[PDB]
Amino acid sequence: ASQALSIDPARPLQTLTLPGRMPPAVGDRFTWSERNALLFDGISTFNVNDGGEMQIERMITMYRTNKYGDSDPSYLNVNTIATLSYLRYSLRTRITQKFPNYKLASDGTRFATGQAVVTPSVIKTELLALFEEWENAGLVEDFDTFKEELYVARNKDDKDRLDVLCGPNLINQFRIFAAQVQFIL
Amino acid sequence: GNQRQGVAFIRVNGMELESMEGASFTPSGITREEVTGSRVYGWKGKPRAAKVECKIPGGGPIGLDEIIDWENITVEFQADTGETWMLANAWQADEPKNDGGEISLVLMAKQSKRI
Amino acid sequence: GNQRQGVAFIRVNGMELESMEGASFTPSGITREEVTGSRVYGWKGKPRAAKVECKIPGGGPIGLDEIIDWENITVEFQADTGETWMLANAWQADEPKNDGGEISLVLMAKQSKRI
Amino acid sequence: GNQRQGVAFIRVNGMELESMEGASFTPSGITREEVTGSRVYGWKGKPRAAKVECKIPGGGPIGLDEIIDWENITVEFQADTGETWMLANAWQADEPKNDGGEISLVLMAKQSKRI
Amino acid sequence: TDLAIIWTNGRGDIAQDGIDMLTDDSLTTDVTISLFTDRRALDSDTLPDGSDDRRGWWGDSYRDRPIGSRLWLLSREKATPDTLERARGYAEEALEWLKTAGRVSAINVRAEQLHQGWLYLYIALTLPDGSVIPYEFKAAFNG
Amino acid sequence: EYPLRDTGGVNDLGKKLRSRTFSACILNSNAETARDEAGALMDALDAPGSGELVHPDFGTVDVMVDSWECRTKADELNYYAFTVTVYPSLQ
Amino acid sequence: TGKGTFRNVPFLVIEEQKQAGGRRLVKREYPLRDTGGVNDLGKKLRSRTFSACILNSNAETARDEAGALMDALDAPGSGELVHPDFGTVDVMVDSWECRTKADELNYYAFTVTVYPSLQDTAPDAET
Amino acid sequence: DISFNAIPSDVRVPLTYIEFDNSNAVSGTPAPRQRVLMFGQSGSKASAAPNVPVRIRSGS
């Protein structure tokens, strides 16, 4: 799991063989219905290949209910956790690389060119460019809604603190392979 | 009766350039060309890249030594009445010359988005 | 003593653009060329496509993002003194560049038809 | 509110020339060009050489006989507000012609450095 | 007239019909077998698993043709157009053997992403004027 | 041409075949229907026997294909151009 | 995305592509007769060809990619060519070129022609 | 096309649905649609409510 999620976070783990592992006997392996019902209870499942080697069928976190008490599928996939961690790291390192130590000034103020000043309208464009890089990489889906939902402002209570609200849209993985054959008789 | 257009502001990496009047901006998309036989059949696409051209006064805080080595910048062509176009990963273009007192800058990019 | 000509309005999909002065409209038909040997023989036809060209002041309600994506529209080149020509199903053409404060629009179509 | 640009002085071997207005200076670097296939792919570099062009009024202390024979000189393109660029070992270029009263000088060099 | 491949719970097993197993003599069984059986991956192809074996059939060196389709290369994929194009190509190369013979006339296959997490393939085969009306069914789930 | 004499002989033996050739192009704005049409025309150009050709300049005629190309310039996204030379079938 | 590959070595497509091939004809012209014609003889192979380019912003990754592409084009056997226009076809290479210009520091141009890798015996033994 | 309700909500395993058809509609898109109506009697053991339209796709 670590190797796969380090190579590419937004990639499912539908068929990954476990090398050098001995599966249980054919009388102990969970049936299809048993595995299906067990996947809802927050426990991941395994499958046995055509050869003797066993593989992981689906990796799922034990998260099954929201804070208020109802069911919530947001944090189900481990891919969401991995992608979120990578996105947080990318944001942190891009901000650190671009604006290490800059003065903070209001949006409308203008100073001498070539000075170290950041305005709330600069980091917004920086984040939009970062999102476009994410979309090129293949981890985020929709750019228009991200642009229309992104919000960056000054704190208005503490002088040097900038509040952001990104709300990105993660990419999706293929679970079902629907096919439809049509005979033109 | 809002202001239509005027002096346009160029910003790379978050720094203004104070370019002189005459800034131009070509967005990136598909170019349509006609195809003609016995009649006109339709259009034939051709890709193009986004580009921003301007001229800056010489002797300013940003000099040619800094200008030449530009291969990864985030350009923002912004008008007076909003209408900002962002070039994600742009690079300098064919030739800078310090003719008279104006340096001609042209920055090209693979994609142009509206902010 | 009727009014001859002046600012000519362009309407795409039933909306105006406020095109500045200098609009041009080439109609669709047959292009005649001369064939000469020992003595002049006649004419040799050649098809062409309708085209309407204008310039839009920048910063207006209609921007470059909407202007670029135009491949199925109905155009209405209407002069001051009536005489409207409908371009059938037009598409945007070679290159829009926003120099100064002007967007150079050109729309080509397979059939211009007088209304 | 510093002075931006104006008359730019040229110095060869530590001696001024009194060049008339209109001096130009193209620095040495890499020329970028765009490569377009199905989409835009990137940039394709290309080397270039530094060059300083100006005009000297005729009849002065320095004449065409001395101007022609220049294949190892150190040029110093200095603007009004400092910002001097040095050409280490420059050589005269294509053609001097004394039309009117102006000798058109152009000096090429392999490398230009900002002092 | 051979047995029929009946799809239940995502896998296809033979089923009974009255006295013996239900029979079918049409292109349905020919397609559902040529599409959903793993054939040998090439030497250069990369495998979805971390393993190193390539599927196939021991009779591949006996039946004069590779048996099935390489659609098992898309076991784990993310929603990008690259996978859609690859699936279209793999289906075409798997079903080309029908058009090489005279059992179909033309094949048109398109790929799309339906409701999030769905790879949708639309395959249209043009049967000639001498083809037995083929079998039709829908996959069903039980228990 | 007879040596050491001015005169020469010229004789006729039949008529040469008509080597009619043409160029065509198919483009569609869908950029996928264009590929479908190009594939269909390729399959119809490579086929056994002789099939009828309808052309504005030539008209209905029965011919056999000899060669063709699909020169797409990559930059063009909808354009496919063929160039075909055909000869009459022997009857 | 124009990302054609030959043996999982990626390349970018440019210039012009080409597929050519038709039936082989034998021209039958009779002496002192006007009506003639041709006779069908099979169908010649489909000779595909393409032009690809390897470019980068590093001038060393470009060299490495070009070397990999050369060593993968010059390999024994038949490889899965992927092309945005041709599709996925197993083909056998016939020739190629690697053109630079000593002025472009990143550009490497290739021009390849391939033939289908179909191998069927002449006698076609039966029972 | 395929209705989202086809796959039951109780499954979270990769499934690979499959469907077969026999019509002539190649595009699959809703062109100007034709809905021919058919009046007719039905014999005994019909097991169909009289006087209500029924959509049928096969002779069986």
From Swiss-Prot, chain A:
Effects seen without this gene: No tail is synthesized.
Family statement: Belongs to the myoviridae tail sheath protein family.
Induction remark: Expressed in the late phase of the viral replicative cycle. Expression of late genes is activated by the viral late transcription activator C.
Membrane-crossing residue ranges in chain numbering: none
GO cellular component terms, semicolon-separated: host cell cytoplasm; virus tail, sheath
Classification of source organism: Viruses, Duplodnaviria, Heunggongvirae, Uroviricota, Caudoviricetes
Localization per record: Virion; Host cytoplasm
General function of this protein: Polymerizes as an extended helical structure around the baseplate-tail tube complex. During ejection, the sheath shifts to a contracted form, thereby making the inner tail tube protrude through the host cell envelope.
UniProt entry keywords in alphabetical sequence: Host cytoplasm, Late protein, Viral contractile tail ejection system, Viral genome ejection through host cell envelope, Viral penetration into host cytoplasm, Viral tail protein, Viral tail sheath protein, Virion, Virus entry into host cell
Oligomer status and interactors: Homomultimer.
Origin species: Escherichia phage Mu
Protein name as annotated: Tail sheath protein
Shown residues in whole-protein numbering: 311 to 495 of 495
Main location: virion
GO terms of biological process kind: symbiont genome ejection through host cell envelope, contractile tail mechanism
Superkingdom of the source species: Viruses
UniProtKB/Swiss-Prot annotation, chains B, C, D:
Keyword Acetylation carried by entry: no
InterPro entries cross-referenced by the UniProt entry: Phage_Mu_GpM_tail_tub
UniProt entry keywords in alphabetical sequence: Host cytoplasm, Late protein, Viral contractile tail ejection system, Viral genome ejection through host cell envelope, Viral penetration into host cytoplasm, Viral tail protein, Viral tail tube protein, Virion, Virus entry into host cell
UniProt key word Cell cycle: no
Inducers of expression: Expressed in the late phase of the viral replicative cycle. Expression of late genes is activated by the viral late transcription activator C.
Function: Polymerizes to make up the central tail tube that is surrounded by the tail sheath protein (TSP). Tail tube protein polymerization takes place around the tape measure protein (TMP) and is probably directed by chaperone proteins. Upon binding to host cell, the tail sheath contracts and the tail tube penetrates the host envelope. The tail tube is involved in viral genome delivery during ejection.
Name by which UniProt lists this protein: Tail tube protein
Organism whose genome encodes this protein: Escherichia phage Mu (Bacteriophage Mu)
Origin organism lineage: Viruses, Duplodnaviria, Heunggongvirae, Uroviricota, Caudoviricetes
Name of the coding gene: M
Curated annotation (Swiss-Prot), chain E:
Keywords assigned: Host cytoplasm, Late protein, Viral baseplate protein, Viral release from host cell, Viral tail assembly, Viral tail protein, Virion
UniProt GO cellular component terms: host cell cytoplasm; virus tail, baseplate
Superkingdom in the source lineage: Viruses
Compartments (UniProt record): Virion; Host cytoplasm
Gene Ontology biological process terms from the UniProt entry: viral tail assembly
Disruption phenotype: No tail is synthesized.
Record's note on what induces expression: Expressed in the late phase of the viral replicative cycle. Expression of late genes is activated by the viral late transcription activator C.
InterPro entries: Phage_Mu_Gp46
Function: Component of the baseplate. Probable connector between the central and peripheral parts of the baseplate. Probably involved in tail assembly.
Subunit: Part of a complex composed of three DNA circularization protein N, three baseplate hub protein gp44 and three sub-complex wedge (made of two copies of each baseplate protein gp46, gp47 and gp48) that forms the baseplate.
Protein name, as recorded: Baseplate protein gp46
From Swiss-Prot, chain G:
Record's subcellular location: Virion; Host cytoplasm
GO terms of biological process kind: symbiont entry into host cell; symbiont-mediated evasion of DNA end degradation by host; symbiont-mediated suppression of host innate immune response; viral genome circularization; viral tail assembly
Highest taxon of the lineage: Viruses
Phenotypic effect of disruption: No tail is synthesized.
Assigned keywords, A-Z: DNA end degradation evasion by virus, DNA-binding, Host cytoplasm, Host-virus interaction, Inhibition of host innate immune response by virus, Late protein, Viral genome circularization, Viral immunoevasion, Viral release from host cell, Viral tail assembly, Virion, Virus entry into host cell
GO CC annotations on file: host cell cytoplasm; virion component
Induction annotation: Expressed in the late phase of the viral replicative cycle. Expression of late genes is activated by the viral late transcription activator C.
Recorded GO MF terms: DNA binding
Stated role: Required for tail assembly of phage Mu and responsible for circularizing the viral DNA after it has been ejected into the host cell. Following infection, the circularized DNA can be isolated as a supercoiled, non-covalent protein-DNA complex, in which the protein N is bound to the ends of the DNA. Protects linear double-stranded DNA of viral genome from host exonuclease degradation.
Domains as described in the record: LysM-like fold region might interact with peptidoglycan to facilitate DNA ejection.
Protein name: DNA circularization protein N
